[PDB]
Amino acid sequence: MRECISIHVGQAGVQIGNACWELYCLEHGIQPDGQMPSDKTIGGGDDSFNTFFSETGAGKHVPRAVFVDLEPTVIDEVRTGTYRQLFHPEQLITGKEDAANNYARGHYTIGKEIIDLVLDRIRKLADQCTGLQGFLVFHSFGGGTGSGFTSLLMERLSVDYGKKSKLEFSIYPAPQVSTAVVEPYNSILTTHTTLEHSDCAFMVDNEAIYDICRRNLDIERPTYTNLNRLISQIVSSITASLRFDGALNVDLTEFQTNLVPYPRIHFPLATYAPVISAEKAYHEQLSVAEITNACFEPANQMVKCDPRHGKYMACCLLYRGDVVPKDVNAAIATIKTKRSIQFVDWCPTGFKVGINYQPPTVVPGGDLAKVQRAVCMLSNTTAIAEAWARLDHKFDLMYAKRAFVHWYVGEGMEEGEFSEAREDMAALEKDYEEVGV
Amino acid sequence: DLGKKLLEAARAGQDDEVRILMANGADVNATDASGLTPLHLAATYGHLEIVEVLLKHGADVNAIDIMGSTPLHLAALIGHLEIVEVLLKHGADVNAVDTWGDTPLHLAAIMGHLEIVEVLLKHGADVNAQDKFGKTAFDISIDNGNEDLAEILQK
Amino acid sequence: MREIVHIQAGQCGNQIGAKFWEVISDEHGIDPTGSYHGDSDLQLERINVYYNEATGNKYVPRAILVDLEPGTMDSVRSGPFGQIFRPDNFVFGQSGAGNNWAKGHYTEGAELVDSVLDVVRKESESCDCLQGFQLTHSLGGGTGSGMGTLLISKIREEYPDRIMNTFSVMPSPKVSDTVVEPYNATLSVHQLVENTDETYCIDNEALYDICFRTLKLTTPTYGDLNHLVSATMSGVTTCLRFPGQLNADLRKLAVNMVPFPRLHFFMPGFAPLTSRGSLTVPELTQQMFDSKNMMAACDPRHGRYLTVAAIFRGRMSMKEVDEQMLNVQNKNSSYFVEWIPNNVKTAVCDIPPRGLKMSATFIGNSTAIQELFKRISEQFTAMFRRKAFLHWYTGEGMDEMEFTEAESNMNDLVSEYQQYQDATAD
């Protein structure tokens, strides 16, 4: 057992973090007050779920989570919600004036007024751990706090926790639910400043989740509640190996050994299947092969890109539920040939497989139907550079005219950081191209 | 010097003081340092009584300053409708041109004095007159989006 | 970001500011006594943005009343919502300005500005979380224009990081045939370019053409014009007064609408245009971008939109609104700048204004606003070329270079709108 600390920054990180911990408690059997009936050891434990949940003397299971936001509106709903009794009160840090969708406010002016308090509360959770292995950071790209404050936090965590791992669940901006016109700016600025300090980053394209809710969940206009419930379902499938028994991605160090061949290219692509609406409660049960085929369909990916346009450097399959290991081997043998899948020459063409024999848990009120078998594929492909190419283009269109730039220069930031961040992005696209895309 | 006193009297609107000075031989056609006569100031500051008085005592109705502004130019600019008609009744040049190519019709159209615009056209205002930039009174209405002004110029 | 300190200065500022407090109080359910006689608790969410909370469920507007003319003091008290203001927030002087921008800005108003500033602190320091200020005034006068811009600069010196917002009423010969108003407006625009973060351009010329030609009002009154002003100020402050999705922030509005600091003059629009006492989703979006619904005498089809914010109010399906806005962007793609991707933001609010079941408010940063500035500059140049009435201004201590610098600043402002109107992304 090696503990993981989850950090939620900004509205996007907090609201997705709220739905994630609700799903964790339903998967582990934890009640909103923190009571776990199927926990024999009281006051302590060596079990796998202890990597995410600490235990008090009264049998209370408290998440190892910190909620940070420069304004209190979003966190106040967590302070009065259903799971208000679950989280530590002193781990819900709120300011009074947010970053106003401005990277410079979150990183330089406003963020510095609360940065020392956030680290002291993170230090308190770290002192309770017997073997802290790393952090999980949830934040948005286009927000002022999610981009500016997170990069400042990632810089401080690398100094205090030098040898610890740090993973990201980032919210890629989408015009359908975007809040700011300068979100391409904040996305490029926080990437350049967090690239060195991050070991692995799972990007969540808001447009990809948007289309899945419209097409597969029959939702005419998806809200933040519909998106976050599907996102947390995929986040749980990714972190399930850290929370349960298994042999694939058992710790944070193994995540980058299996998915990150080189430090700068640490953006794996997540694919989830099946996504079935809850109104079809008597749907036909898809087989292991039919959900494995769906992992190589671009309409099921968490980031809108074309994987057959690029090359694979790593492929990991995480199954959940009624799954026989020989059925997976048969499904791979066909897909290994019947589909246009190309691995780079320097990578051993393989498919790592890990099976969890418990079917996924659905939250009451969600839009998903109960399934007896599901799969989450994590793959590092060069096709994910298309997301950077679409993001850098909107950056170039505005920065050429220096639009909205004065808002950033007026908050302690220098204009030279804009050109420095775009050059770092041009080298990143150049890193994917020199591998094969 | 009564010429300098008649300038200040015509501006402030002291009618009795204007009569006293002209009785003592004050130059009705005196000018200030910029070429403004008592008729210029009386027309600018809207003193209709002094306007009719000066015109009865040898005031040049078409005098110009260093910038070429007639009393009708200043009256059309500020918007003194009655003074405009009194000047025209005494032979004021309706198409006089200042150093910027502007006519009395240009200034009345720019400042939106529609009533004065209608009076100038009745007395024969040239609608084809161009300023230094080539704009006519019609061009000013089209470029300003003034539909009421363009309708008046399309009689 | 919550509390907003309202300030109204001058005869036009107090007049259009009184209508603002009458309309929004009807929407939030507040009687002139101050009690909350509403039927929905949605009217008390972020109610403290424009109101204080006194004992007895009594809500007091956070407004400060300024004017040099002592007659304006009794003009507000005798109104319907007249005695819902603090007697301590009435700051009035002995004599007026008489349409002289120099009197309000340098002499008379300089003696009363400190009397207002000390009242601003009492409201500001008693705020829980202040975000900015909004000012209603005209630019053609002497008090709201001369002292108004002076008061803005004095407030910014003590609140530098706060947002400054203004509702400026542009002069027009159709409503007021005074030849010194182009002097006052041009001198005030020289101040608004530097000391304000966002300015709504309410044009009396556009208001007259709406009442006279659209509303078929033969002799439009100030009440006819202010009916459109009060209906526009309510829509632009919809998010500032109700939850929805945009959580009401003057700063986040400016970050997303002002790409260049000098270009912070907004073109408001409203639909449907209704008279006094007297539409589908594809209908509201259509009129919202029509030249006949803009509160500024400018044709939006003569320029390009830098940023656009639209607020829909009433019962309507959220999906249909997203279809028409994307559809209008397609049919009118040539009127949006291609180097600002996704420059159109759509807002929605359940609570509509009274007397209406559906409405739409347009907030556009269009380059076509140069037509308005070219108009005031042309009137200014014609008057200044002949030095007419310039002694009325220099006698109060003003330098003649200030006129040449104010005209040079606005001509440069027009040139900047033209530079980006012709720029391409390639």
Ligand SMILES: Nc1nc2c(ncn2[C@@H]2O[C@H](COP(=O)(O)OP(=O)(O)OP(=O)(O)O)[C@@H](O)[C@H]2O)c(=O)[nH]1
């Ligand atoms: N999927 C999802 N995305 C969200 C959610 N909330 C916000 N976002 C995204 O976050 C982006 C804006 O950043 P926010 O997180 O809302 O702002 P912030 O991090 O609080 O920083 P500030 O600008 O200071 O408020 C938008 O592009 C949204 O798409 C959410 O609940 N779910």
Ligand SMILES: Nc1nc2c(ncn2[C@@H]2O[C@H](COP(=O)(O)OP(=O)(O)O)[C@@H](O)[C@H]2O)c(=O)[nH]1
């Ligand atoms: N729309 C509108 N404009 C007004 C109103 N009152 C005055 N104005 C305009 O404001 C200008 C006069 O400025 P004013 O506010 O009276 O002078 P001040 O006392 O120095 O601020 C004129 O050009 C009017 O057209 C009003 O109630 N509504």
Ligand SMILES: COc1ccc(/N=N/c2cc(OC)c(OC)c(OC)c2)cc1O
């Ligand atoms: C061109 O891109 C954008 C344009 C406008 C955007 N938001 N607009 C507003 C408008 C508001 O009131 C009118 C708000 O209430 C004060 C408001 O509070 C946050 C936001 C957002 C954009 O990404």
Ligand SMILES: [Ca+2]
């Ligand atoms: Ca235990």
Ligand SMILES: [Mg+2]
């Ligand atoms: Mg926020």
